[PDB]
Amino acid sequence: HWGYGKHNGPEHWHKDFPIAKGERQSPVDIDTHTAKYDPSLKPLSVSYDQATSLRILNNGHAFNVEFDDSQDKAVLKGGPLDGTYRLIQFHFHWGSLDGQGSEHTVDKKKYAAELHLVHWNTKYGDFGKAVQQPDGLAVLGIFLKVGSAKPGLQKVVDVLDSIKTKGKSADFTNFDPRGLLPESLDYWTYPGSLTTPPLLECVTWIVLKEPISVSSEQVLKFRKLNFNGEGEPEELMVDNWRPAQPLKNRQIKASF
Numbered sequence: 001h002w003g004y005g006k007h008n009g010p011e012h013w014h015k016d017f018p019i020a021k022g023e024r025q026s027p028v029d030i031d032t033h034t035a036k037y038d039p040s041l042k043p044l045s046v047s048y049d050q051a052t053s054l055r056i057l058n059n060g061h062a063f064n065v066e067f068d069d070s071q072d073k074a075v076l077k078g079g080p081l082d083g084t085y086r087l088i089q090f091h092f093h094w095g096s097l098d099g100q101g102s103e104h105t106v107d108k109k110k111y112a113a114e115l116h117l118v119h120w121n122t123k124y125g126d127f128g129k130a131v132q133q134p135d136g137l138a139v140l141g142i143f144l145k146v147g148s149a150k151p152g153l154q155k156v157v158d159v160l161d162s163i164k165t166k167g168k169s170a171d172f173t174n175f176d177p178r179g180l181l182p183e184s185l186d187y188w189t190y191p192g193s194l195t196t197p198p199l200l201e202c203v204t205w206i207v208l209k210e211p212i213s214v215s216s217e218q219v220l221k222f223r224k225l226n227f228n229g230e231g232e233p234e235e236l237m238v239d240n241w242r243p244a245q246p247l248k249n250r251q252i253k254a255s256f
């Protein structure tokens with residue numbers, strides 16, 4: 001099965017998912033001198049006051065915080081988006097070391113981790129239908145740098161103990177995604193895909209300029225998770241990041 005090891009790593013995915021070599025693959029390197037300031041791009045609109053977190057799950061490649069997406073409770077609009085995108089889940093990508101973890105890179109600079117807030121276009125009625133469309137998904141990308149602790153993240157840090165191995169889930173209600181957002185909403189956008197199999201090219205990437213800082217110890221607990229199921233040989237959940245893919249003439253636009 002696909003994973004991040006030498007035998008089932010990103011360099012092998014193409015065999016099972018040929019799209020791996022597609023035209024709008026993610027992630028990419030964000031070259032700051034090359035991105036284009038586009039003045040016709042609107043401010044992002046993040047309405048998360050009504051978000052309904054449900055549970056946290058270890059799915060073997062990361063941990064997903066899942067939300068009730070049966071109604072327009074936590075949504076994203078504006079920016080380069082047309083229509084309403086409902087928040088479904090959020091997860092991270094992190095490294096074995098603080099000098100790596102992020103998927104996206106800024107001027108070839110890698111951050112300690114990358115937060116992904118996954119949203120789906122509501123005119124397609126369900127997540128499953130949306131991944132089949134060019135504009136089915138909106139993914140908010142936030143970088144993590146090691147510094148001071150992030151208040152807002154501790155609730156997550158605390159439950160990781162209960163979902164140590166693959167297939168474990170925990171109740172995780174009343175969690176507010178707002179405590180994960182940076183002050184500024186300045187962004188870069190490009191059309192890309194899912195960063196994990198099936199790597200479908202259904203994403204409008206929205207990558208935030210301003211990183212959020214988290215402490216060493218916060219980051220250390222992510223690294224305690226296991227890719228493996230319970231009663232199996234232990235394999236620490238580390239470096240679950242896909243390297244940068246060719247931009248192939250796509251244009252990266254900037255809101256600033």
Ligand SMILES: O=S([O-])[O-]
Nearest residue numbers: 116139194195196
């Ligand atoms: O949401 S991204 O990792 O496919």
Ligand SMILES: [Zn+2]
Nearest residue numbers: 091093116195
């Ligand atoms: Zn992701």
